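Researcher: Final request for today, and then I'll write up notes for the group meeting. The sequence and the SMILES for flavin-adenine dinucleotide follow.
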Amino acid sequence: CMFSNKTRQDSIQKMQQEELDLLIIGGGITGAGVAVQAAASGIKTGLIEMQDFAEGTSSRSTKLVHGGIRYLKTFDVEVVADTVGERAVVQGIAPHIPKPDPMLLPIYEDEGATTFNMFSVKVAMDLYDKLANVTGTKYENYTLTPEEVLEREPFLKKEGLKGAGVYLDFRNNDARLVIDNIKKAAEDGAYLVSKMKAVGFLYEGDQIVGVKARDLLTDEVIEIKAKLVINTSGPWVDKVRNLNFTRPVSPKMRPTKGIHLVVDAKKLPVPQPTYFDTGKQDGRMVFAIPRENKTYFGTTDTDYQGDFTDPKVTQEDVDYLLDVINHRYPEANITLADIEASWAGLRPLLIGSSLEREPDGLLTLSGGKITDYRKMAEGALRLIRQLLKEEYGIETKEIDSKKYQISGGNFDPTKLEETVTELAKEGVAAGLEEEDATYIADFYGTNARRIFELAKEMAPYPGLSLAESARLRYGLEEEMVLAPGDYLIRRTNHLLFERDQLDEIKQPVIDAIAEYFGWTEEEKAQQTKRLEALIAESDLRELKGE
Amino acid sequence: CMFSNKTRQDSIQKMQQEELDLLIIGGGITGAGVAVQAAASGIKTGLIEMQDFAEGTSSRSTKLVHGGIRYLKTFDVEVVADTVGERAVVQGIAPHIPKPDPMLLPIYEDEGATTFNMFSVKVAMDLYDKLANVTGTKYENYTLTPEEVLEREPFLKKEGLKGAGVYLDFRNNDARLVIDNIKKAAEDGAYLVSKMKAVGFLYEGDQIVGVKARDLLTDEVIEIKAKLVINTSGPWVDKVRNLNFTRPVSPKMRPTKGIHLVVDAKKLPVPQPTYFDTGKQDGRMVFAIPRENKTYFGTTDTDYQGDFTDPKVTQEDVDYLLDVINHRYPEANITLADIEASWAGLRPLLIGSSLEREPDGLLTLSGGKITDYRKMAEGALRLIRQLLKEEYGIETKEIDSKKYQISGGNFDPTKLEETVTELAKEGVAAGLEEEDATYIADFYGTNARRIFELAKEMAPYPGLSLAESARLRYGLEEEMVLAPGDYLIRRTNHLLFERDQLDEIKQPVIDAIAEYFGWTEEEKAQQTKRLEALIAESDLRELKGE
Ligand SMILES: Cc1cc2nc3c(=O)[nH]c(=O)nc-3n(C[C@H](O)[C@H](O)[C@H](O)COP(=O)(O)OP(=O)(O)OC[C@H]3O[C@@H](n4cnc5c(N)ncnc54)[C@H](O)[C@@H]3O)c2cc1C
Ligand SMILES: Cc1cc2nc3c(=O)[nH]c(=O)nc-3n(C[C@H](O)[C@H](O)[C@H](O)COP(=O)(O)OP(=O)(O)OC[C@H]3O[C@@H](n4cnc5c(N)ncnc54)[C@H](O)[C@@H]3O)c2cc1C
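Model: Predicted protein-flavin-adenine dinucleotide complex:
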């Protein structure tokens, strides 16, 4: 009853009846973070997202919160300083999301110029730690001799190995970070509508005072009045600005594509995130990263033109990434045939982040990275509060976003294990396996409680376990799942990181969702056909010649 | 009687009668440092220098021992690490030479791209300190607001001023560092001859086993046999190698010229070394540095061709440097007319330092910087010992150059003031003004004692004070002064940093030296004519149109 299709319909109607203080365009991490800070400050807030929440770039990143340690090679210390400081801030407000996962960075001497050597990587990590106040911490950096490295990863290229550095950085489920931000703002009374696209502006003089939005489920278009409209559409930032035709819009964005590939862990069983120069002397570094029972690689950097909602993996990208990986791991012999899942996204690159008011009144928050996200929203709020005070003489609350914990993260950021262990008991008590109880505690954090409540008093959907049925029900009832892909792709890691177990639950999931919505056989068939398209896409069936 | 023209004549003869274990070519800081380590290890050592000691690049530097903090902008941490570590090592073995003189580095925002800003300069200085183990020290870095900077230097460009950083680095009298190295090696029994040029090699098969050297005072050429010959001729490194004609000698050096200009302090009274971007956006930084009662600027960087012994200041160099200085100090209005002294030198640039054995057996130690000098000689000794052991089965002592104190520096590197204060008393007791006693204590360190002894039992030369006569006598008797320029230029700061008091003692100095040597009226006139040439050169009389 909290955040579902019904809630959405309520919000759609409410947004047409009352003038909002702020209308947000874009339901990615940027807009999600602004929405959370606005609602918590006591501001009539609305947010429209044409796709599912996080379906943009916020669910296509490398899935970590890091500080960009490579930028220290050119001495961009302020950029690196701001980012690593936010690393701990985000951990503090979303303890169940970003988790510490020390990086292993091997150095070679037989591949030409490198980002670091044995000596400079040590200095780099010490500075990295200093800027992050990690220097004393247990996550304090250190180095490893070639032998010690080969211990952790005996399949790594031995030729040229000079050793490695091990420093702290965070693995992070980006889609979840966005959703569990959205859910907070909702809990704080904001109107949040997915599947709604901004398609034109409402004007008073030359000033924007609302938007024409198309309900993408009914195709009906409504008017939404608002005192302030802020554009947080990521790589779509210019397309939204260009809805206004007053003057030549100078482009502020120039998005590049990056892809990622997933393989079963056994084929390349890195025990921890591994980062290194490509060996191609192209000025790039690539990862190999464990997640559940897979490792995944990227990434990739190409100029892009075309559909922004569905960027695709090309054989050029696969050749490059697999060329890099097989060079670094001489005996893994990985090919397209081993790829279980994949994904591609567009970087919202400027020309870090930018906050602008344009002549027509439109506010735009662009660029940046997921890690910077709540620092970006803070700047936006500072200006939004000022503008509300100025132009509408309306006062608002001052909050401390660095301490405002999002949905499911309302617990001591220092006690993740104790909180998971404690919640895992309630789950076993709700009637679930200890394994599933723990996974759910760690994944949804505090929200696991609600999931367990639903598990205790419900009958599992046909073809699904009680644990799985509880999660799906929760997603449908409190995470605005509208399509099976939202759930299998975005609310969970089924598609990307559990592909070998997807086929067993795919249909049962669609059945239960179509059941919950009361779909026609027409709609259920349309939804099914679409899911298959998304799966075939991630599976790279076309590149495999299937 | 210790180190004079007589000593030199003795060495010239000894070098023709006994086969040396090592013959060094070049009496700059590099060869001086190798000579000190060789002799202290118990190695029959000889060194020939065609000019006066340090008359090469070692007396034409910016006269400081620093770590090249600018190199941190490109993250060359190992290069910067080695240098700043040696900073303290050299201070420890020559406590009377290099002294701490915190740098003031102002930052501007209105001159385009800069090496640092307010934020990065702080990070840079903290790293600089860390690498040097200065972090806790009283010399720990810090920043200053524009106002605080304007306090120290009210004549600095105020427009664009964002503040400044203050970190530790050392002022250093390079010529003295070289001489007080030479004097140690002498004291440890090495043969050291100035005014002697290596002009060809002595061969056994295709192997060098000595050199033909020309006594530049008599023009007689002698043969010197040696088991090992090492080339430490700075920017002259290729010219020495090319004495052998066996094959196409690929150039390893490519020297560039840099100049410095001196003005009376009153015209630009920086209270401490000041370093900044030129504002020209040429990727360069310039100093303004106090020394005695002047400030001096540089420096400069031009490809060079011509006579290596006498590189000259050009109006192009003066225009550039004065353009930079007047831009940084809007109201100083400095022109050539205000220049009291100047000097130019050639950087021994490779293509840091290099140690090679070539096919004909010649050893070459090139590149580097004054600060690296004893670390460079250590590497050279490691190889020289090995070679002596190998090819001649001769064993040698192992010494710790990081703790071997040079001439006049045999005291606790932590007690400079107490040592100066204590020595200043002996000088007053020897019959000298307290001012002169202190200056002499600080300048010659422990050697001041000998100077005072000579002052107590001698009559001042005509036209010179007792203090001045004692120094000159010491230079002649124990610092191998052969020409007035050695003394006025190199043993002391008369020419460069006391130009307004030179004319009063110039003639009296020549008289006393000609007297001490028993010059003909022919020679004294030749020496006089030459000194005038050197003075006219530093005075830039030709550029001034005089
Ligand atoms: C390959 C790759 C790897 C990356 N790696 C990392 C990393 O490891 N760590 C990190 O911090 N960052 C990383 N980044 C960048 C980071 O993911 C992005 O900066 C971040 O997700 C941008 O968030 P956003 O909210 O601005 O945009 P998005 O998430 O793209 O959302 C914009 C939203 O607005 C919607 N929208 C567009 N037009 C309209 C409209 N007219 N009406 C209504 N809604 C609309 C879109 O559907 C979309 O959901 C990576 C990026 C890429 C491409
Ligand atoms: C403008 C400028 C500023 C600088 N600033 C600094 C600084 O602030 N700090 C720092 O550490 N470094 C600085 N450097 C560099 C530093 O001064 C040099 O690296 C150092 O002095 C080189 O010492 P050297 O002993 O190798 O050479 P040199 O001092 O040049 O000596 C080589 C010697 O061998 C002699 N010689 C040549 N041929 C023969 C021969 N055939 N027979 C006998 N003898 C011969 C020469 O006369 C000469 O005395 C600067 C250099 C320049 C040009």
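Model: The CA atoms of residues 155 and 329 of chain A lie 6 Å apart. The interface with chain B takes residues 72-75, 77-78, 81, 117, 119-120, 123-124, 126-127, 130-131 of chain A (CB under 8 Å).
Researcher: Thanks, that's everything.
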